[PDB]
Ligand binder design. Structure first.
Ligand SMILES: Nc1ncnc2c1ncn2[C@@H]1O[C@H](COP(=O)([O-])OC(=O)C[NH3+])[C@@H](O)[C@H]1O
Length: 526
């Protein structure tokens, strides 16, 4: 034998997930609608779907099922199999779903028994052959007979050897893991495709800063169309923890849900705190099981975070980031003794990811920016997506190159204070309405079309004490024929119900660019 001086042999996060599944095969992985499923049972369903899709040559699967076993089965199946999932909004119309399938070139849909009625309306008008997937408990026979122009696949659940998990699998970290959609100013949705490496970077950051163990119980509050749900699902999975799906009819009682199931980990928009306070459920020490509370999506007010922390007596974490940069990109542990009015959004998981550009147009890396520096936050790094899917115009305006790396204009205005970022607002009219992202211009565009009005303003209203808007109202000019029943009827076909204006005003003149605050002040007077 020859004497040898050296040897060299040619995804860590994916490995951790596969290992977690093996290590906790007999443990509960998912609770949904009064049923519990172990890691082994979820693995059997997931790899059965995944194997079948591989043989079918499916890459993208749309998911119509919501808050149901079939949705989580398909999401695990897509992840384990290196495929791309596309969650469909629970209140999307037939037409909106068609637009999504077309834009994402997807002809495969995972359904369940609760969605068969919506599916039927889709199948009725879609001319192209769709491939419909369901678990064996779903009776697809009548629809199969009724729609031979489409194809229905019942996938049998085979038992799967979890010992084989690590070798039975994938080497395109740049393939898309999921595709989200968000509000576009013209009513055409922007689509955001998030890669495996985007997702793996995020999960690895959160797992190392805030590690869970297999005894943890993770809430799944957010809709699957909102990327917070991606956090819930994969955070639980990498930890071998149990994910608890919040039933639709319990989203309005979050504190009771947490206490009822003794949840140890929670993530939602901070509106949830206000709601819990309104229902008189947030008394001190009332939530002892909740050891990690994350909030993302809207400005976290100090007083809100304080009241939630008194209930849990445990850490509260502010998370910030847009869907375009994979869930959250900064974080800040809430400090009760900060004496500030809002909770900072903090600092990035990874250094060299943030820059601020001021009104002069000077780009400044976060590490170099001085105390008090102010301007628009720019994002970069491994969590940033390539741009918007098939939308070069929006990509060009939001994404740009600068000395080697791709930066993204968040639109968020921040200040650097005492070494952390404070979120001050936005330069545009993107807002959250009841916790959901929307462009006020998308609503205005729809209302303009439907009313044919010359002048239109969309105003977030009413506002809570924290400044969170639960709805919108519309102002139209006094020259358009007043037909608010007809207007309402048409808006519901073009906007999610959350965004449809709940109150309509015919007003002689708008206060002035439209002064949204003045309209808010006026509305407060009645
Ligand atoms: N912790 C926080 N504080 C203040 N604003 C936040 C925030 N987290 C998110 N936002 C706002 O939400 C926008 C992104 O909304 P989104 O629906 O794309 O994604 C999320 O909320 C979490 N991925 C950000 O650009 C920012 O305006």
């Amino acid at each position: 034998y020859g004497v040898v001086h050296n040897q060299f042999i040619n995804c860590e996060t994916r490995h951790s997930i596969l290992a977690a599944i093996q290590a906790n095969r007999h443990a509960p992985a998912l609770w949904v609608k009064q049923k519990t499923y172990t890691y082994q049972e979820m693995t059997d369903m997931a790899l059965s779907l995944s194997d079948y899709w591989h043989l079918q040559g499916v890459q993208r699967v749309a998911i119509l099922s919501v808050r149901d076993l079939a949705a989580y089965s398909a999401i695990w199946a897509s992840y384990l199999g290196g495929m791309t999932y596309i969650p469909l909004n629970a209140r999307a119309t037939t037409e909106q779903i068609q637009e999504t399938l077309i834009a994402t070139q997807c002809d495969s849909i995972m359904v369940d028994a609760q969605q068969l009625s919506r599916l039927s309306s889709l199948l009725e008008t879609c001319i192209d052959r769709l491939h419909i997937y369901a678990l064996p408990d779903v009776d697809v026979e009548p629809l199969r007979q009724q729609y031979p122009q489409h194809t229905f696949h019942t996938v049998q659940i085979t038992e799967q050897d979890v010992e084989l998990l690590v070798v039975k699998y994938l080497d395109n970290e740049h393939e898309y893991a999921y595709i989200m959609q968000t509000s576009g100013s013209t009513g055409k949705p922007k689509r955001i495709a998030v890669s495996y490496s985007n997702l793996h970077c995020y999960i690895s950051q959160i797992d190392k800063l805030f590690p869970l163990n297999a005894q943890d119980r993770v809430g799944q509050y957010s809709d699957l169309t909102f990327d917070l749900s991606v956090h819930d699902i994969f955070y639980s999975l990498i930890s071998g923890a149990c994910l608890y799906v919040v039933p639709e009819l319990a989203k309005l009682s979050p504190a009771e849900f947490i206490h009822h199931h003794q949840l140890t980990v929670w993530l939602s928009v901070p509106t949830v705190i206000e709601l819990a306070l309104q229902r008189q459920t947030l008394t001190p020490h009332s939530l002892p099981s909740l050891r990690l509370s994350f909030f993302c999506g809207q400005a976290l007010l100090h007083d809100l975070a304080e009241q939630w922390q008194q209930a849990t007596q445990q850490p509260v974490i502010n998370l910030y980031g847009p869907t375009e940069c994979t869930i959250a990109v900064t974080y800040h542990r809430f400090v009760a003794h900060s004496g500030m009015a809002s909770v900072p959004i903090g600092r990035a998981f990874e250094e060299e990811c943030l820059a601020i550009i001021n009104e002069q147009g000077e780009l400044m890396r976060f590490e170099s920016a001085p105390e008090g520096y102010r301007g628009e936050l720019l994002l970069s790094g491994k969590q940033l997506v390539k741009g918007y899917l098939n939308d070069p115009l929006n990509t060009q305006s939001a994404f740009f190159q600068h000395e080697g790396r791709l930066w993204y204009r968040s639109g968020d205005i921040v200040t650097k204070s005492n070494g952390v970022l404070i979120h001050l607002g936005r330069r545009d009219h993107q807002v959250k309405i009841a916790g959901q992202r929307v462009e006020l211009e998308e609503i205005e565009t729809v209302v303009r079309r439907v009313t044919q009005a010359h002048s239109v303003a969309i105003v977030p209203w009413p506002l809570s004490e924290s400044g969170y808007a639960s709805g919108t109202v519309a102002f139209v000019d006094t020259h358009t024929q007043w037909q608010p029943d007809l207007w309402l009827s048409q808006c519901k076909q073009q906007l999610n119900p959350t965004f449809v204006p709940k109150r309509w005003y015919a007003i002689e003149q708008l206060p002035r660019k439209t002064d949204i605050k003045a309209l808010q002040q006026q509305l407060a007077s009645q």
